[PDB]
């Protein structure tokens, strides 16, 4: 029954402030402490502060004291963490975990990102370099490059060419994200039968195809 249903992912510009909501279910709200931990990309977990419904009083990490603020909503049994003057290094996933004799059950986490600008990706085709088919199978791909934000969505021939597809993790190059997807088919389908990658970039209303043509 216990559930720590955490609030939706965030995205803001520097100097902005966010408030994370952590609704809890499945246990008595007043019996346990709620902790607000911070996991930043690579640097892993970080304790921020904790509030005690059991005493009302809150406890903060001094390196966070002025940045974040913990409040409790007993009426709905919901904890909140406020983040102020957001900056680049404040970008991460924020978790709420309940007390006990350990950080027993955690929330699903809420991601917060601060940064720059929105940019649809510039998609490029990747075609075999005058090779052929060694296994009678050929691999074509698509360069989903320099976009913002995430995520990117890539399909091959409208999701009709589902097998053979490998869509890779985005990468941060010029403080924009570059991605990759690849399809493997027999050497008969290409180029006789059309092969196209459909990349959808949500934040920009983008839906663009890249027909792949032999060099």
């Amino acid at each position: 029954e216990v559930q720590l249903q955490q609030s939706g992912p965030e995205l803001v510009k520097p100097g902005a402030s966010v408030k994370v909501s952590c609704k809890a279910s499945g246990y008595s709200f007043t019996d346990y402490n709620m902790y607000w931990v911070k996991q930043n990309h690579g640097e892993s977990l970080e304790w921020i502060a904790y509030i005690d419904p059991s005493n009302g009083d809150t406890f903060y990490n001094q390196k966070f004291q002025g940045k974040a603020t913990v409040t409790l909503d007993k009426s709905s049994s919901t904890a909140f963490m406020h983040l102020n003057s957001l900056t680049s290094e404040d970008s991460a996933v924020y978790y709420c975990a309940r007390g006990g004799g350990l950080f027993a059950f955690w929330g699903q986490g809420t991601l917060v990102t601060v940064s720059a600008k929105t940019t649809p990706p510039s998609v490029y085709p990747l075609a075999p370099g005058s090779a052929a088919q060694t296994n009678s199978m050929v691999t074509l791909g698509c360069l989903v490059k320099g976009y913002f934000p995430e995520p990117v969505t890539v399909t091959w021939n409208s999701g009709s060419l589902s097998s053979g597809v490998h869509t890779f993790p985005a990468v941060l190059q010029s403080d924009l994200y570059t991605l990759s997807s690849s399809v493997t088919v027999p050497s008969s389908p290409r180029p006789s039968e059309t092969v196209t990658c459909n990349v959808a970039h949500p934040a920009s209303s983008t839906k663009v195809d890249k027909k792949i043509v032999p060099r």
Binding site: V37, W106, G109, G141, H166, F168, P169, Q173
Partner: protein, 212 residues
């Protein structure tokens, strides 16, 4: 306060017993630290494993056992399974502050060692007119999920561009990933051979092309 020292990454196999440690830099680790261990399964999924330097169950396997060694805490996994493969974080309490360890990355080999199929792509048409030449090296169906990717341009080992990613798992449980080589057209139109050689254990699978 101090430095909670954890293993960076460890690997084991089903039926084996694994030992994880967590060191306190302030010294002897006691009950006043309330040593806690959490588990993070790779979906950025978190859960409590052991608290009170002892306490076991919310429904945590009997095989997971925590302890206090002397100047550090130890999480022993006796009879290690594949689903234990996750990231283990430790936490020591000094006052009024909580410090978590770096996190111990435990991989449980639960499938045969498979090798990567690499496919090198040269810069596209449309792209090269943008003064840019991105080479892409896809790495697919490799288990375990660890590879290093080396480039050399015209035999010249590359220290530039090299944007390799962390291996993401595939439907078949194996891993996939790619490495990018970006630079300018002039550079591109400057050499002949561009090679990507992938490292997955003691074998390097190279992949080249002579554009011109």
């Amino acid at each position: 306060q101090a430095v909670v020292t954890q293993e960076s990454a460890l690997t084991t196999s089903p039926g084996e017993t694994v030992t994880l440690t967590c060191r306190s830099s302030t010294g002897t680790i006691t009950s006043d630290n309330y040593a806690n261990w959490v588990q993070e399964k790779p979906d950025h999924l978190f859960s409590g494993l052991i608290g009170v330097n002892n306490a076991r169950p919310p429904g945590v396997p009997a095989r997971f056992s925590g302890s206090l060694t002397g100047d550090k805490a130890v999480l022993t996994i006796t009879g290690a399974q594949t689903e234990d493969e996750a990231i283990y974080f430790c936490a020591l309490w000094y006052s009024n502050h909580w410090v978590f360890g770096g996190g111990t990355k435990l991989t449980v080999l639960g499938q045969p060692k498979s090798s990567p199929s690499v496919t090198l792509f040269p810069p596209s048409s449309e792209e090269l007119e943008t003064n840019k030449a991105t080479l892409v090296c896809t790495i697919t169906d490799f288990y375990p999920g660890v590879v290093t990717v080396d480039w050399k341009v015209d035999g010249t080992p590359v220290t530039q561009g090299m944007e390799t990613t962390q291996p993401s798992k595939q439907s078949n449980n194996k891993y996939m990933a790619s490495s990018y080589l970006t630079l300018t057209a002039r550079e591109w139109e400057r050499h002949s051979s561009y090679s990507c050689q992938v490292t997955h254990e003691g074998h390097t699978v190279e992949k080249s092309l002579s554009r011109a």
